[PDB]
C-alpha cells in the first residue's frame, strides 16, 4: 500500500574520517585472510552479501532492502537463498566489533564497496545512514531470484527494484567474481579466469566460449565451457535476448563504460528505499589502501 519511509541518519557524530577506517579495516583483513576459497579471498562473497541484503527490496511497499540490516536475524540469515553468505558475515563481525557504532547495514553495504574497489574495480560512492531495524522488519525468505530462468524472468525480477535493462546487465557483470559452489547454490564452477580481479571478462566469456549444456550432481543444468568456466541459465539469457545482447557486446568491448555503469547501478542497488535528507553528507569516495600507501 502506502509505504514506510526510511531516513538515513549519520551514526552520531561520525565523520568521513571515521568511515575510511571502517573501510581500511576491511581492506586490510581482505589481504590478511586471502586464503579462503582457494586464494580467491573474501572479496567476491562480500560483493554478494551486499547484494543479498539490498536485493530483498520491494518498491511497492518499500520493504526489505539494505536499511534495517535484518540479515543479522535468524529468518533472513537462514534463508536458503543466502547460503554461503554466512562466511562473509563472520569475516565482517570482528570488524563490527572494532567499530561498534556502525550500523549492520552500513557495515554490510560498505563491505561490498570495499571489495569492489580493492579488486582493481571502479570507485563507488557510498552513503552512511542506514539504521538497524527491529527483528520484525525482516522480510520473508524468498524475494531473491532463481538461477534457472530466462531473460523474461530476469527482466521482470529487476523491475521490483526499479532496475532497467542497462542496469541489470551492468550488475550481472559482477559474476566475473567468485564462483558457484555445488554445496551452497546447487551449482559448481567459476565464470572465468581471474575471479578475484574486477574486469569485464564475464561478457567476453559469454560471447566467446563454447557453452555446452550439462547437468550436475545437484541435478541442475548449467552451461559449461571446456575452458573450465560455467554460466548459470540466467547469465545465459543476457545473450538469448537482443536487448540485453546489445548491451553485453557494448560492455564486452569497453570496460571503462562497463565500469561506469556499475558504480552507478551498484550504489543505486545499495540505496533503494533510503531517504537521504539535506542535512546529509554527500556520497564519500573512499581511498583504497594503494592510495594511502598502506
Amino acid at each position: 500500500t502506502t509505504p514506510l519511509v526510511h531516513v538515513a541518519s549519520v551514526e552520531k557524530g561520525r565523520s568521513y574520517e571515521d568511515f575510511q577506517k571502517v573501510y581500511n579495516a576491511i581492506a586490510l583483513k581482505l589481504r590478511e585472510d586471502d586464503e579462503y576459497d582457494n586464494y580467491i579471498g573474501y572479496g567476491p562473497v562480500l560483493v554478494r552479501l551486499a547484494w543479498h541484503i539490498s536485493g530483498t527490496w520491494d518498491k511497492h511497499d518499500n520493504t526489505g532492502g539494505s536499511y534495517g540490516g535484518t540479515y543479522r536475524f535468524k529468518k533472513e540469515f537462514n534463508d536458503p537463498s543466502n547460503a554461503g553468505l554466512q562466511n562473509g558475515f563472520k569475516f565482517l563481525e570482528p570488524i563490527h566489533k572494532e567499530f561498534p557504532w556502525i550500523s549492520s547495514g552500513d557495515l554490510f553495504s560498505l563491505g561490498g564497496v570495499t571489495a569492489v574497489q580493492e579488486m582493481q574495480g571502479p570507485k563507488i560512492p557510498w552513503r552512511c545512514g542506514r539504521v538497524d531495524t527491529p527483528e520484525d522488519t525482516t522480510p520473508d525468505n524468498g524475494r531473491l531470484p532463481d538461477a534457472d530462468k530466462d531473460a523474461g524472468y530476469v527482466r521482470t525480477f529487476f523491475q521490483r527494484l526499479n532496475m532497467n535493462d542497462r542496469e541489470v546487465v551492468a550488475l550481472m557483470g559482477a559474476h566475473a567474481l567468485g564462483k558457484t559452489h555445488l554445496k551452497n547454490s546447487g551449482y559448481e564452477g567459476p565464470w572465468g579466469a581471474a575471479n578475484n580481479v574486477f574486469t569485464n571478462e564475464f561478457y567476453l566469456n559469454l560471447l566467446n566460449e563454447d557453452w555446452k549444456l550439462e547437468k550436475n550432481d545437484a541435478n541442475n543444468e548449467q552451461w559449461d565451457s571446456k575452458s573450465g568456466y560455467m554460466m548459470l541459465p540466467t547469465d545465459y539469457s543476457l545473450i538469448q535476448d537482443p536487448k540485453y545482447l546489445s548491451i553485453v557486446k557494448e560492455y564486452a568491448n569497453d570496460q571503462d563504460k562497463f565500469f561506469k555503469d556499475f558504480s552507478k547501478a551498484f550504489e543505486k542497488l545499495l540505496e533503494n528505499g533510503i531517504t537521504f535528507p539535506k542535512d546529509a553528507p554527500s556520497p564519500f569516495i573512499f581511498k583504497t589502501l594503494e592510495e594511502q600507501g598502506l
Binding site: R31, E32, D34, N38, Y39, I40, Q120, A193, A194, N196
Partner: protein, 104 residues
C-alpha cells in the same frame, strides 16, 4: 612451506599469465623456467621492457620474497600488473612451489 599450497597460489594469481616449464609458451608473461639463478628480462623470446632486463638482478628466494610484496615498487615502469602478495607465509609458499615447478 608447501608447493602443495604453493601450487594453488600460482594457478590462482599468476598462471593466467605464465607457463613454468621450458617450452612453456609465453602468454602475456614469459615462461618461468630458469628462474632461480637468473637475471631480469631473461626469458629468450619475450618482449621485455628496458626497465625489466635492466633491473639487472638474479632471481633468488629472498629476491622474490621482496618482489612479491610489490612488483611495481621493486621495478618501476613494468607490464606485470599484479599488486604483489603482501603476506610472508604465502609469498613463502609460492616461492617454494616455484623452485620445483620452474626447473624440474
Amino acid at each position: 612451506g608447501d608447493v602443495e599450497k604453493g601450487k594453488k597460489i600460482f594457478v590462482q594469481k599468476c598462471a593466467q599469465c605464465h607457463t613454468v616449464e621450458k617450452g612453456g609458451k609465453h602468454k602475456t608473461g614469459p615462461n618461468l623456467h630458469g628462474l632461480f639463478g637468473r637475471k631480469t628480462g631473461q626469458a629468450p623470446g619475450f618482449t621485455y621492457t628496458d626497465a625489466n632486463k635492466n633491473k639487472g638482478i638474479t632471481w633468488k628466494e629472498e629476491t622474490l620474497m621482496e618482489y612479491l610484496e610489490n612488483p611495481k615498487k621493486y621495478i618501476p615502469g613494468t607490464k606485470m600488473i599484479f599488486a604483489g602478495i603482501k603476506k610472508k607465509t604465502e609469498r613463502e609458499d609460492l616461492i617454494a612451489y616455484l623452485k620445483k615447478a620452474t626447473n624440474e
